[PDB]
Write an enzyme that holds these catalytic residues in place. Structure first.
Site, PDB file in Angstrom:
ATOM      1  N   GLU A 124       0.843  -1.263   0.000  1.00 43.22           N
ATOM      2  CA  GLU A 124       0.000   0.000   0.000  1.00 43.22           C
ATOM      3  C   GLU A 124       0.863   1.293   0.000  1.00 43.22           C
ATOM      4  O   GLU A 124       1.856   1.409   0.761  1.00 43.22           O
ATOM      5  CB  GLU A 124      -0.915   0.022   1.247  1.00 43.22           C
ATOM      6  CG  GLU A 124      -1.971   1.135   1.144  1.00 43.22           C
ATOM      7  CD  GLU A 124      -3.037   1.081   2.266  1.00 43.22           C
ATOM      8  OE1 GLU A 124      -2.975   0.243   3.185  1.00 43.22           O
ATOM      9  OE2 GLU A 124      -3.954   1.899   2.247  1.00 43.22           O
ATOM     10  N   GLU A 302      -5.517  -2.986  12.524  1.00 44.47           N
ATOM     11  CA  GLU A 302      -5.310  -3.938  11.400  1.00 44.47           C
ATOM     12  C   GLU A 302      -6.337  -5.070  11.351  1.00 44.47           C
ATOM     13  O   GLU A 302      -6.746  -5.475  10.227  1.00 44.47           O
ATOM     14  CB  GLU A 302      -3.872  -4.534  11.305  1.00 44.47           C
ATOM     15  CG  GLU A 302      -2.721  -3.429  11.362  1.00 44.47           C
ATOM     16  CD  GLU A 302      -2.913  -2.241  10.398  1.00 44.47           C
ATOM     17  OE1 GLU A 302      -3.566  -2.346   9.349  1.00 44.47           O
ATOM     18  OE2 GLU A 302      -2.379  -1.195  10.726  1.00 44.47           O
TER      19      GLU A 302
HETATM   20  N1  LIG Z   1       1.883   4.203   2.538  1.00 43.46           N
HETATM   21  C1  LIG Z   1       2.016   3.749   3.722  1.00 43.46           C
HETATM   22  N2  LIG Z   1       3.087   4.149   4.423  1.00 43.46           N
HETATM   23  C2  LIG Z   1       0.982   2.856   4.414  1.00 43.46           C
HETATM   24  C3  LIG Z   1      -0.262   3.417   4.535  1.00 43.46           C
HETATM   25  C4  LIG Z   1      -1.246   2.702   5.198  1.00 43.46           C
HETATM   26  C5  LIG Z   1      -1.000   1.438   5.734  1.00 43.46           C
HETATM   27  C6  LIG Z   1      -2.195   0.802   6.318  1.00 43.46           C
HETATM   28  N3  LIG Z   1      -3.364   1.277   5.547  1.00 43.46           N
HETATM   29  P1  LIG Z   1      -2.573   1.342   7.960  1.00 43.46           P
HETATM   30  O1  LIG Z   1      -3.851   2.455   8.121  1.00 43.46           O
HETATM   31  O2  LIG Z   1      -1.502   1.012   9.115  1.00 43.46           O
HETATM   32  O3  LIG Z   1      -3.619   0.135   8.182  1.00 43.46           O
HETATM   33  C7  LIG Z   1       0.232   0.821   5.616  1.00 43.46           C
HETATM   34  C8  LIG Z   1       1.223   1.568   4.954  1.00 43.46           C
HETATM   35 ZN   LIG Z   2      -5.483   1.529   8.377  1.00 45.68          ZN
END
Ligand SMILES: N=C(N)c1ccc([C@H](N)P(=O)(O)O)cc1
Ligand SMILES: [Zn+2]
Ligand SMILES: [Mg+2]
Ligand SMILES: [Mg+2]
Length: 889
Positions: A124, A302
């Site tokens: 992501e 999560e």
């Molecule tokens: N681009 C990123 N650094 C990144 C963004 C969001 C997420 C996950 N969506 P989170 O909101 O921890 O669940 C994990 C990684």
């Molecule tokens: Zn998240």
């Protein structure tokens, strides 16, 4: 840099139905073979087939097992692979490729990368295109079949999504595992992990269907004994979702894996959640208290994504707040329910009003659903997350628990297994709203402005009481300041949970009531009000607004003492402090400006001091709450209320107000610090890995807060207390003994003692770094340079970098030194970091977010540094776009 606009969304002219991956990990390279079973969609118009693919080294690409010719049949520019349409089939077809990538040298921590001796992916939002070619957007849903192979001795544990269907030996000491995941998912939810991982596990049996779910929590071998609390948190999260929402886990296993190098807290990838080690691992011996709530919230977060991100999907990244703000809301409900402490909600409010409000009045202000972006890596913001969570929580305030639950079920029930937008959420709440109001004329159309409108609304009050008529009126106004995104701001739908407190006996005068303010102003009248009330406004912090309560400090004191709502009590305290801060700040500023030889300061309100003592001395009051009332509002909260803020004048104001209250209460603080010891430091459960007592940790926060107050005040013989504290088994205590010893000659002796206690646990050493970085030391610049030379060195671990430099940036006197040397130091660190990790470089820009709010000399110094960074020939696109938006270029 291309600008993506929300209004430009259109579906792909391609379909990817099946992905079949072979990821072969070698010591100097990883070869990735991928076959995509694809189709032409109904939206196709004979266009070039264009895949995302960043940094990939092509060995070969094919369509239908026929090798394609570079230059003639395709171009690749290290960002997009273009297959000219004349070579693209017009029915179902297979695209295949083999590329080489290098997780060992992947220090940006996106795509596939090596963290210590574990290989792990982070997809992501746009990391899957760093692994192999794809149409890397969340509306491309596909089935996945993934084989990983590697050296068996280096990588005995192989994980990816779905069922492990095969395991097999390979010549030359290698092995493989195949994982098939039939349900459709977007590519940002693919994950793979290979490592010498050790684990704890448990079986969970779901509430309704009675399905056994296997839970595994993994880490490197050294830290496997720090996994137990995370496993407990996972169980709690599953039970909460069952209990509150009626939602059960759908799969037969859930893996959590800790890695040492990670850009944020963690990542939901379907059935395979990967975490920053600092948000998964803890022990009583080797973690500060804050780790326990942090792991509960990140594990919960999560887990909750498994519905709100994973089973109801995002159509495009503009809808990010629908998965993130909704999941932060679920995570906050869960934490409030697990900790049962009022400080949990207060801490969420404190974060919104310091960090997010600062963002929303900065040049970076954006609504929770923005209209455009350049960098998806900079879209993950406190606005999208934490103001999105307040927006999602307002639905619950408006509806109440029964109808909110009904509307949430409507949304889940209708959109389970499809993509969604913010409107669909709003539609679902509206159906519940019609059911609550019992009429289908009623709508939430105006509510949608919470998604589109940027800036913090200001809500102000005036009052009237007619004693003869027994009639009380609250007159309410809302205003949002125009900004770059809307020149004309429309009134929002603002729910105002209110109470009326009888100032004679402290009693509630009306039942639970939430005012629905829907106009620029309204007057709410209440009859049969026997006495003039004090109004308890925005209980629970019921909307994300600046509250101007226009109450006297006498009324505020009455609320602080006698109101039933924790937030309103705290907010009344906060407002008393802000009135005092702004007055003294102005008195100090005038004295500095006019070069006065003598001047007066307004003292702190004596009755406010007495109310603080009354609360501290109350054996039935909450220790966590007490810790909030003796702490001034955060610096980044204060700054929202002063123009051209001079950080030295603010530092002198805080110093005056703290000394004023301390000169009255320090004996009280000492006595409490002593009487709290037995319960706060109780060791009965220190060796019980699963016994976590949030109330007891709140007592430690209070003793540590009081100890700090006493140390700054050089209270008689407090160094005795400090030295005794250094010997505590709890790291929260002995690290506090380091920071508070800053004011004594024993500091470097405690620095060495605590370094020795910290140095053999990777995460505890990071907490020790933070404690050093935040220490109130006059020789703080020399101390940073010692950390750089002796501990941090050339580390590219973002936890190490952030631990050394972020806490230091909150040092009001010293980071903001008028030479600009602090701004220079952070800019040097940003630029150095940006060479290998643009995401973390951007995170390290945080101190600069308020540049245009400081005094004109400091605005200029910060702007000079930002402009220097912007001039770096090697600046990342990420960093450049962020600094351009921040500096209004
Ligand atoms: N681009 C990123 N650094 C990144 C963004 C969001 C997420 C996950 N969506 P989170 O909101 O921890 O669940 C994990 C990684
Ligand atoms: Zn998240
Ligand atoms: Mg009475
Ligand atoms: Mg390390």
């Amino acid at each position: 840099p291309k600008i993506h606009y929300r209004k430009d969304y259109k579906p792909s002219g391609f379909i990817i139905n099946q992905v079949t991956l072979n990821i072969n990990i070698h010591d100097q390279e990883t070869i990735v073979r991928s076959v995509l079973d694809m189709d032409i969609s109904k939206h196709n118009v004979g266009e070039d087939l264009v895949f995302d693919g960043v940094g990939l080294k092509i060995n070969e690409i094919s369509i239908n097992n026929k090798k394609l010719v570079e230059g003639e049949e395709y171009t690749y520019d290290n960002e997009f692979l273009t297959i000219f349409s004349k070579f693209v089939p017009k029915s179902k077809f297979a695209f295949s490729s083999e590329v080489i990538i290098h997780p060992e040298t992947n220090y940006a921590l996106t795509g596939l990368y090596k963290s210590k001796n574990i290989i792990v992916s982070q997809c992501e939002a746009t990391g899957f295109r760093r692994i192999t070619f794809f149409i890397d957007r969340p509306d491309m849903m596909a089935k996945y079949d993934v084989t990983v192979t590697a050296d068996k001795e280096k990588y005995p544990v192989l994980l990816s999504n779905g069922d492990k269907v095969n395991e097999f030996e390979i010549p030359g000491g290698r092995h493989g595992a195949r994982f098939n995941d039939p349900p459709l998912k977007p590519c940002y939810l693919f994950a793979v992990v290979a490592g010498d991982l050790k684990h704890l596990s448990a079986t969970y049996i779901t509430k309704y269907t009675k399905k056994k779910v296997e839970l595994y929590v993994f880490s490197e071998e050294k830290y496997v004994s720090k996994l137990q609390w995370a496993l407990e948190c996972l169980k709690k999260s599953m039970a909460f979702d069952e209990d509150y929402f009626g939602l059960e886990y759908d799969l037969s296993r859930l893996n959590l894996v800790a890695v040492s190098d990670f850009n944020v807290g963690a990542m939901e990838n379907k059935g395979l959640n990967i975490f920053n080690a600092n948000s998964l691992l803890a022990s009583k011996k080797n973690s500060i208290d804050f780790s326990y709530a942090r792991i509960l919230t990140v594990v919960g977060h999560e887990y909750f994504h498994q519905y709100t991100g994973n089973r109801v999907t995002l159509r495009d990244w503009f809808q990010l707040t629908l998965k993130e703000g909704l999941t932060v809301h679920r995570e906050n409900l869960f934490s409030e329910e697990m900790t049962k402490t009022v400080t949990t909600r207060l801490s969420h409010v404190d974060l919104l009003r310091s960090v997010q409000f600062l963002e929303d009045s900065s040049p970076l202000s954006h609504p929770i659903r923005p209209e455009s972006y350049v960098s998806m890596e900079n879209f993950y913001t406190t606005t999208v997350y934490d103001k999105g969570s307040e927006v999602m929580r307002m639905y619950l305030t408006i509806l109440g628990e029964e109808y909110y639950k009904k509307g949430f079920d409507i949304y889940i029930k209708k959109n389970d297994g499809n993509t969604a937008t913010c409107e669909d959420f709003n539609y679902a709440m509206e159906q519940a709203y019609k059911m609550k109001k019992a009429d289908n004329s009623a709508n939430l159309n105006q509510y949608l402005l919470w998604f589109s409108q940027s800036g913090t609304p200001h809500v102000s009050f005036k009052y009237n009481y007619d004693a003869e008529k027994k009639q009380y009126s609250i007159h309410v106004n809302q205003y949002t300041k125009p900004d770059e995104n809307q020149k004309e701001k429309k009134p929002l739908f603002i729910p105002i949970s209110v109470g009326l407190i009888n100032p004679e006996n402290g009693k509630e005068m009306i039942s639970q009531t939430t005012l629905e303010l829907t106009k620029e102003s309204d007057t709410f009248v209440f009859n049969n009000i026997a006495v003039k009330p004090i109004p308890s406004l925005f209980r629970g912090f019921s909307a994300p607004v600046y509250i101007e309560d226009q109450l006297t400090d006498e009324e505020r004191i009455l609320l602080l003492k006698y109101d039933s709502d924790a937030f309103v009590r705290y907010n009344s305290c906060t407002n008393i402090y802000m009135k005092q801060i702004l007055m003294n700040y102005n008195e100090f500023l005038k004295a500095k400006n006019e070069k006065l030889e003598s001047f007066q300061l307004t003292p702190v309100n004596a009755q406010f001091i007495d109310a603080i003592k009354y609360l501290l001395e109350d054996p039935h009051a909450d220790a966590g709450f007490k810790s909030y009332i003796v702490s001034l509002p955060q610096d980044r909260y204060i700054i929202n209320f002063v123009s051209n803020l001079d950080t030295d004048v603010l530092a002198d104001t805080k110093e005056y107000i703290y000394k004023q209250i301390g000169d009255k209460l320090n004996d009280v603080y000492y006595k409490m610090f002593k009487s709290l010891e037995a319960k706060a430091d109780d060791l009965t459960y220190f060796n019980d890995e699963s016994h976590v007592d949030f109330d007891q940790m709140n007592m430690r926060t209070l003793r540590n807060t009081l100890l700090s107050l006493l140390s700054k005040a050089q209270y008689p013989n407090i160094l005795n207390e400090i030295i005794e504290h250094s010997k505590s088994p709890y790291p929260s205590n002995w690290l506090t003994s380091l920071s508070v010893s800053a004011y004594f000659d024993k500091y470097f002796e405690l620095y060495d003692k605590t370094y020795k206690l910290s140095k053999d646990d990777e995460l505890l050493l990071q907490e020790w770094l933070k404690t050093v970085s935040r220490s109130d030391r006059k020789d703080i610049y020399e101390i940073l340079k010692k950390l750089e030379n002796e501990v941090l060195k050339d580390s590219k671990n973002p936890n190490d970098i952030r631990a050394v430099y972020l806490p230091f940036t909150n040092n009001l006197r010293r980071f903001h030194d008028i030479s600009g040397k602090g701004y220079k130091l952070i800019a040097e660190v940003i630029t150095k970091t940006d060479k290998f990790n643009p995401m973390v470089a951007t995170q390290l820009c945080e101190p600069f977010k308020l540049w245009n709010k400081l005094d004109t000399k400091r605005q200029e110094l910060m702007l000079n540094e930002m402009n220097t960074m912007l001039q770096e020939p090697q600046i990342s696109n990420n960093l450049k776009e962020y600094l351009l938006r921040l500096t209004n270029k």
